Design an enzyme around this catalytic site. Structure first.
Site, mmCIF file in Angstrom:
data_model
loop_
_atom_site.group_PDB
_atom_site.id
_atom_site.type_symbol
_atom_site.label_atom_id
_atom_site.label_comp_id
_atom_site.label_asym_id
_atom_site.label_seq_id
_atom_site.Cartn_x
_atom_site.Cartn_y
_atom_site.Cartn_z
ATOM 1 C CG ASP A 122 -4.824 1.937 -1.215
ATOM 2 O OD1 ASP A 122 -5.901 1.813 -0.536
ATOM 3 O OD2 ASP A 122 -5.303 0.765 -2.048
ATOM 4 C CG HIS A 165 -2.136 -1.149 0.613
ATOM 5 N ND1 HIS A 165 -2.015 -2.299 1.824
ATOM 6 C CD2 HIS A 165 -2.895 -1.223 -0.136
ATOM 7 C CE1 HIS A 165 -3.077 -2.666 1.230
ATOM 8 N NE2 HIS A 165 -3.826 -2.447 0.318
HETATM 9 C C1 LIG Z 1 -1.988 -9.300 -4.804
HETATM 10 O O1 LIG Z 1 -3.374 -10.294 -4.318
HETATM 11 C C2 LIG Z 1 -3.684 -10.305 -3.359
HETATM 12 C C3 LIG Z 1 -4.171 -8.384 -3.857
HETATM 13 C C4 LIG Z 1 -4.313 -7.649 -2.964
HETATM 14 C C5 LIG Z 1 -5.819 -7.895 -1.828
HETATM 15 C C6 LIG Z 1 -6.774 -7.440 -0.912
HETATM 16 N N1 LIG Z 1 -7.069 -7.712 0.036
HETATM 17 N N2 LIG Z 1 -7.541 -7.497 1.033
HETATM 18 C C7 LIG Z 1 -9.112 -8.640 1.214
HETATM 19 C C8 LIG Z 1 -9.641 -9.264 0.502
HETATM 20 C C9 LIG Z 1 -10.333 -10.227 1.272
HETATM 21 N N3 LIG Z 1 -9.380 -10.975 2.099
HETATM 22 C C10 LIG Z 1 -9.913 -12.732 1.983
HETATM 23 N N4 LIG Z 1 -9.955 -12.595 3.267
HETATM 24 C C11 LIG Z 1 -10.243 -14.258 3.473
HETATM 25 N N5 LIG Z 1 -10.129 -14.614 4.896
HETATM 26 N N6 LIG Z 1 -10.264 -14.852 2.699
HETATM 27 C C12 LIG Z 1 -10.722 -14.543 1.111
HETATM 28 S S1 LIG Z 1 -10.510 -15.977 -0.025
HETATM 29 C C13 LIG Z 1 -10.425 -14.391 -1.022
HETATM 30 C C14 LIG Z 1 -10.373 -13.192 -0.912
HETATM 31 C C15 LIG Z 1 -10.335 -13.348 1.142
HETATM 32 C C16 LIG Z 1 -8.658 -10.464 2.715
HETATM 33 C C17 LIG Z 1 -8.183 -9.786 2.121
HETATM 34 C C18 LIG Z 1 -8.207 -6.340 0.974
HETATM 35 O O2 LIG Z 1 -9.228 -5.736 1.843
HETATM 36 C C19 LIG Z 1 -6.635 -5.481 -0.052
HETATM 37 C C20 LIG Z 1 -7.601 -3.817 0.360
HETATM 38 C C21 LIG Z 1 -8.259 -3.603 -0.954
HETATM 39 C C22 LIG Z 1 -8.524 -4.471 -1.362
HETATM 40 C C23 LIG Z 1 -8.083 -5.896 -1.782
HETATM 41 C C24 LIG Z 1 -6.805 -6.306 -0.877
HETATM 42 C C25 LIG Z 1 -5.496 -9.998 -1.604
HETATM 43 C C26 LIG Z 1 -4.639 -10.081 -2.358
HETATM 44 O O3 LIG Z 1 -4.230 -11.583 -2.562
HETATM 45 C C27 LIG Z 1 -4.331 -12.564 -1.319
HETATM 46 MG MG LIG Z 2 -7.698 1.099 -0.153
#
Ligand SMILES: COc1ccc(C2=NN(C3CCN(c4nc(N)nc5sccc45)CC3)C(=O)[C@@H]3CC=CC[C@H]23)cc1OC
Ligand SMILES: [Mg+2]
EC number: 3.1.4.53
Length: 330
Positions: free
Chosen positions: A120, A79
């Site tokens: 961000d 970020h």
């Molecule tokens: C390159 O790879 C990535 C880039 C960004 C992220 C982010 N992730 N998250 C959330 C998404 C949901 N999440 C999940 N939690 C659980 N328990 N299961 C699961 S299955 C599905 C997901 C998930 C939590 C994080 C954020 O809020 C960020 C801030 C804004 C937008 C996306 C950003 C994530 C990446 O790769 C993982």
């Molecule tokens: Mg954000």
């Protein structure tokens, strides 16, 4: 003396890819002396003639952009200013999609790009839930509601008050109020807690899709127009897995570093370690496939339907990347 340095020339050649998905944004960060957000914003503003349209003095634009970029944390793996620059540039490409040609006004375009650039800003590298659970000042300030996203907006707008930073100084009050409201609506929509509602509304819009006699989308009320812009910037924010693998992997390393660091802090303090944040009990690969299957693919498939067939290569890249990661799970 009047002509570019050689580093500047190499940077300018890389910036010729500014209209392409797959821009070498990390390379641009290196070549610009860690100014990817400033140089990408400036290129886009010139390209879309925004300085002339909104009477933005060029020195003011550059001062603001450098100030904004300096309030992204360089010690944050994901970020940071490179992510901001990437989301700006991806929004810029999405706004050029043939299915939206001539749909959006210059003010809406300005809103979407400015929103992307500030979205961000001053991010500390930890989640909303982490800020809430630690009783941090940000959480108290925003009464635990979209803590980070409220803060990004507040900082983005406050920076306009620094010396020679008011890029909107020549807009009328009516333009400024409309811009401000749209920017707020777009950045607040980047909070992942809003994702399921945004997507449900995007699906409804695909199901009731109307097209003009030119073949572009018909959006005849604020609610639909802002919904499309909100989903567009949200698509950009969730665009990493749709990029060429070399880019995607760098983003994955970065997000994992950021998450693992948060996990270490949680473990240190005896808190529950958040999903994907435990470096001792993580599968990076499974997490990516999960991220794609439950979040990124349902969104981008719905966006692809809205703008059919403009996003087909993006969706194909996403599906290839998904298979790649799936094939590395032991
Ligand atoms: C390159 O790879 C990535 C880039 C960004 C992220 C982010 N992730 N998250 C959330 C998404 C949901 N999440 C999940 N939690 C659980 N328990 N299961 C699961 S299955 C599905 C997901 C998930 C939590 C994080 C954020 O809020 C960020 C801030 C804004 C937008 C996306 C950003 C994530 C990446 O790769 C993982
Ligand atoms: Mg954000």
């Amino acid at each position: 003396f009047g002509v570019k340095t050689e580093q500047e020339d190499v940077l300018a050649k890389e910036l010729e890819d500014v209209n392409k998905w797959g821009l070498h944004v990390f390379r641009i960060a290196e070549l610009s002396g860690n100014r990817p957000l400033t140089v990408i914003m400036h290129t886009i503003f010139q390209e879309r003639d925004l300085l002339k349209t909104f009477k933005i003095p060029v020195d003011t634009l550059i001062t603001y952009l450098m100030t904004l970029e300096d309030h992204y944390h360089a010690d944050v793996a994901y970020h940071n200013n490179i992510h901001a620059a990437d989301v700006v540039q991806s929004t810029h490409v999405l706004l050029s999609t043939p299915a939206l040609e001539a749909v959006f006004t210059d003010l809406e375009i300005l809103a979407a790009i400015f929103a992307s650039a500030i979205h961000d800003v001053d991010h500390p590298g930890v989640s909303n839930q982490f800020l809430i659970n630690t009783n941090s000042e940000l959480a108290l300030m925003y009464n635990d509601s979209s803590v980070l996203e409220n803060h990004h907006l507040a900082v983005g707008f406050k920076l306009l008050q620094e010396e020679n930073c008011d890029i909107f100084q020549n807009l009328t009050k009516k333009q400024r109020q409309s811009l401000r409201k749209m920017v707020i609506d777009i950045v607040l929509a980047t909070d992942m807690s809003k994702h399921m509602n945004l997507l449900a509304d995007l699906k409804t819009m695909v199901e009731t899709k109307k097209v003009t006699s030119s073949g572009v989308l018909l959006l005849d009320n604020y609610s639909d127009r802002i919904q499309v812009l909100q989903n567009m910037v949200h698509c950009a924010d969730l665009s990493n897995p749709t990029k060429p693998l070399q880019l995607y992997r760098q983003w994955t390393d970065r997000i994992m570093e950021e998450f693992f660091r948060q996990g270490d802090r949680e473990r240190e303090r005896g808190m529950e370690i958040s999903p994907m944040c435990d470096k001792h009990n993580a599968s990076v690969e499974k997490s990516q496939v999960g991220f794609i299957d439950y979040i990124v693919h349902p969104l981008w498939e719905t966006w692809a339907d809205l703008v059919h067939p403009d996003a087909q290569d993006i969706l194909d890249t996403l599906e290839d990347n998904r298979e790649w990661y799936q094939s590395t799970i032991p």
